[PDB]
Amino acid sequence: KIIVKHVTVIGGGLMGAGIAQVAAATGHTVVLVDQTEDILAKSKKGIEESLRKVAKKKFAENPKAGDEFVAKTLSTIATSTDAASVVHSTDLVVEAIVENLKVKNELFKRLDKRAAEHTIFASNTSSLQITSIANATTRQDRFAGLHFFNPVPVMKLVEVIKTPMTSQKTFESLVDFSKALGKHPVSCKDTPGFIVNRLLVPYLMEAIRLYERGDASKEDIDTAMKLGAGYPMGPFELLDYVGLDTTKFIVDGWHEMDAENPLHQPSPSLNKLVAENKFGKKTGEGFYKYK
Amino acid sequence: KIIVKHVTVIGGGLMGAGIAQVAAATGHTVVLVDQTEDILAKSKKGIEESLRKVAKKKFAENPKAGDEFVAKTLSTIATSTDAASVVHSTDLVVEAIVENLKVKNELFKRLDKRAAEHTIFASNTSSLQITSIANATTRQDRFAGLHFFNPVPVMKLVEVIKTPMTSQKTFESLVDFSKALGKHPVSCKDTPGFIVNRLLVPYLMEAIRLYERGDASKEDIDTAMKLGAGYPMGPFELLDYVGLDTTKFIVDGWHEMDAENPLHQPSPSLNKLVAENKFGKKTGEGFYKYKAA
Numbered sequence: 173k174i175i176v177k178h179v180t181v182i183g184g185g186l187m188g189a190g191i192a193q194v195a196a197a198t199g200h201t202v203v204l205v206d207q208t209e210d211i212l213a214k215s216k217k218g219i220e221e222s223l224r225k226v227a228k229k230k231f232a233e234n235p236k237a238g239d240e241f242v243a244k245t246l247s248t249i250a251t252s253t254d255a256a257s258v259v260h261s262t263d264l265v266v267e268a269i270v271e272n273l274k275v276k277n278e279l280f281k282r283l284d285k286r287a288a289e290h291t292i293f294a295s296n297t298s299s300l301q302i303t304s305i306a307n308a309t310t311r312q313d314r315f316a317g318l319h320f321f322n323p324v325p326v327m328k329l330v331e332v333i334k335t336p337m338t339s340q341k342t343f344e345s346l347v348d349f350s351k352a353l354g355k356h357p358v359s360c361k362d363t364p365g366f367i368v369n370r371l372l373v374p375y376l377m378e379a380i381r382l383y384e385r386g387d388a389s390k391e392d393i394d395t396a397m398k399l400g401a402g403y404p405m406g407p408f409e410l411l412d413y414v415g416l417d418t419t420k421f422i423v424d425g426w427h428e429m430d431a432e433n434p435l436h437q438p439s440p441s442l443n444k445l446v447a448e449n450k451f452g453k454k455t456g457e458g459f460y461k462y463k
Numbered sequence: 464k465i466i467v468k469h470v471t472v473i474g475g476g477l478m479g480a481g482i483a484q485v486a487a488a489t490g491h492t493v494v495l496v497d498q499t500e501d502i503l504a505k506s507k508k509g510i511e512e513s514l515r516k517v518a519k520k521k522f523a524e525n526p527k528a529g530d531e532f533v534a535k536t537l538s539t540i541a542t543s544t545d546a547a548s549v550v551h552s553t554d555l556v557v558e559a560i561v562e563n564l565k566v567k568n569e570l571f572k573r574l575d576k577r578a579a580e581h582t583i584f585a586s587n588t589s590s591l592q593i594t595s596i597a598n599a600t601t602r603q604d605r606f607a608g609l610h611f612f613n614p615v616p617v618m619k620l621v622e623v624i625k626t627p628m629t630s631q632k633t634f635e636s637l638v639d640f641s642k643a644l645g646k647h648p649v650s651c652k653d654t655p656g657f658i659v660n661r662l663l664v665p666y667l668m669e670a671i672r673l674y675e676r677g678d679a680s681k682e683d684i685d686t687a688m689k690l691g692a693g694y695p696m697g698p699f700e701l702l703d704y705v706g707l708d709t710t711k712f713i714v715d716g717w718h719e720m721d722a723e724n725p726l727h728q729p730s731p732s733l734n735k736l737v738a739e740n741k742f743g744k745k746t747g748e749g750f751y752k753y754k755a756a
């Protein structure tokens with residue numbers, strides 16, 4: 173079996189940085205790749221700060237160990253601005269760059285030529301057909317989806333997306349890697365939305381349409397789902413938390429792919445908020461105003 | 464204002480008994496109504512067993528206290544087989560009987576003649592237009608929906624449904640009553656599913672379709688929604704928990720009113736289980752099998 177040990181994470185953003193951190197924390201050798209030295213420096217800095225925040229807690233009764241732990245985990249993460257030079261002998265490449273199909277495909281088409289034979293390619297894409305990226309290579313049997321959830325270092329779920337061409341060997345390798353990260357992997361075919369978003373987003377859009385219809389206030393709907401369905405956050409609180417722009421992008425995609433399905437119909441309210449740059453918590457305002 | 468003190472609860476089933484229990488526990492005088500003295504005896508007995516179970520846990524440091532609590536609550540719950548015999552002096556009627564329009568309308572059409580003038584009529588129905596029931600009476604301004612959730616004694620939410628004719632006075636009165644019960648009322652128009660079921664049920668159906676479509680197993684979908692979305696129960700565990708027959712019933716209704724809507728298309732797997740009398744935890748088998756206690 174191909175036991176993933178050396179991992180190459182391309183993209184030091186919210187997800188990429190978290191992926192790199194959990195891999196390193198769990199004993200894997202990591203090379204985090206991004207476009208500039210500045211982006212990388214900031215990315216690794218946030219990883220350190222996150223690790224320290226946790227250490228200061230579990231190592232109160234021994235500050236020494238705490239710092240050794242952080243230094244150790246942080247020392248097993250390398251950085252680079254040239255992915256091509258790092259994939260020569262990497263066991264796994266996990267991509268988490270800008271959500272743009274053209275950019276992603278060029279990336280892998282290029283990497284496919286440098287990566288070792290056994291190297292597995294995986295995308296953390298939320299709204300893109302894994303197959304639409306696996307065909308940019310001649311490594312389809314070792315290409316798959318590995319979808320994580322933010323905050324990566326906390327969220328225990330990982331969706332292992334297998335395409336019709338993905339081998340069983342590649343699948344089990346990713347399932348074992350997921351468990352090695354201390355995650356609980358589930359399986360799903362290469363369908364839009366996979367499992368979570370496919371069943372969550374459309375529900376959130378329905379929550380918005382109920383409001384636009386004037387049937388109930390945003391506040392009551394949120395209260396209804398929390399007390400009534402036991403959800404951690406009401407649909408609008410969650411919409412703001414995950415980003416209104418992010419949500420809109422996913423739904424618009426499914427809409428352009430099947431403009432007939434009533435579940436993907438655009439929301440006037442959602443568009444207006446995205447228009448006037450109100451993306452939710454990350455912008456200080458979405459359906460609700462924050463801090 | 465007219466504060467609800469006397470409540471007539473019609474239906475001693477799962478929902479009704481719970482409603483009576485919470486109302487009586489919070490200081491309201493209650494009359495539980497059902498078809499036979501036996502059914503009523505069984506319901507009130509179930510209310511006692513529930514109160515004593517809550518007592519042993521709350522008054523563990525003083526069983527005597529817990530016995531007084533139970534006895535006091537149980538004492539303010541009278542039982543009658545004909546509601547018309549007590550509504551002339553009740554403040555609110557909360558109906559929770561079989562889910563059938565004709566039966567409900569016949570019930571309220573007749574109670575309308577006994578209930579005092581100030582009496583408010585409320586239906587706990589899940590799949591019927593409140594308005595449809597209200598027009599069986601000439602008291603539409605004092606008619607509304609008061610939708611609870613099982614187990615009533617635990618679930619804090621209560622949906623107060625206002626029809627175009629419900630008066631502001633009736634609405635406020637029901638909201639206050641909701642708070643007096645220790646619940647949290649939310650407002651919604653008389654639309655199919657109200658809030659919770661309108662957003663919950665269609666989602667449960669998509670879960671089933673995702674599975675029947677063979678994109679993922681039931682087990683992984685449940686795991687995915689529990690860990691990825693933070694839900695207490697995965698879609699298939701919740702389906703089995705609320706009732707596959709209860710669910711199929713609600714969806715068929717919506718499907719019937721708007722047959723072209725894809726969101727209400729029937730589930731082959733759901734129908735098959737329902738047809739085989741596999742209703743979920745109620746029968747020991749739904750999408751999953753359970754220990755027939």
Ligand SMILES: NC(=O)c1ccc[n+]([C@@H]2O[C@H](COP(=O)([O-])OP(=O)(O)OC[C@H]3O[C@@H](n4cnc5c(N)ncnc54)[C@H](O)[C@@H]3O)[C@@H](O)[C@H]2O)c1
Nearest residue numbers: 183184185186187188206207268269270271296297298299
């Ligand atoms: N945004 C979310 O809420 C979310 C949640 C789950 C999964 N995702 C998935 O994660 C990936 C990135 O999302 P994010 O939130 O981490 O993004 P982000 O914008 O925070 O970070 C992406 C990083 O990629 C870098 N980047 C862009 N193009 C690159 C290229 N050609 N090569 C190398 N680095 C490049 C950027 O400079 C940036 O630092 C996407 O594939 C997306 O579908 C996003």
Ligand SMILES: NC(=O)c1ccc[n+]([C@@H]2O[C@H](COP(=O)([O-])OP(=O)(O)OC[C@H]3O[C@@H](n4cnc5c(N)ncnc54)[C@H](O)[C@@H]3O)[C@@H](O)[C@H]2O)c1
Nearest residue numbers: 474475476477478479497498559560561562587588589613
């Ligand atoms: N099942 C749920 O989870 C749920 C949740 C919310 C609301 N509801 C609603 O609650 C109501 C009852 O549901 P339930 O689960 O409590 O039912 P149930 O089957 O447990 O009990 C219904 C009770 O109504 C009585 N009944 C029938 N016809 C009657 C009549 N003409 N007069 C007086 N009593 C009569 C029966 O004898 C029975 O004891 C329905 O309107 C339903 O849509 C159900």
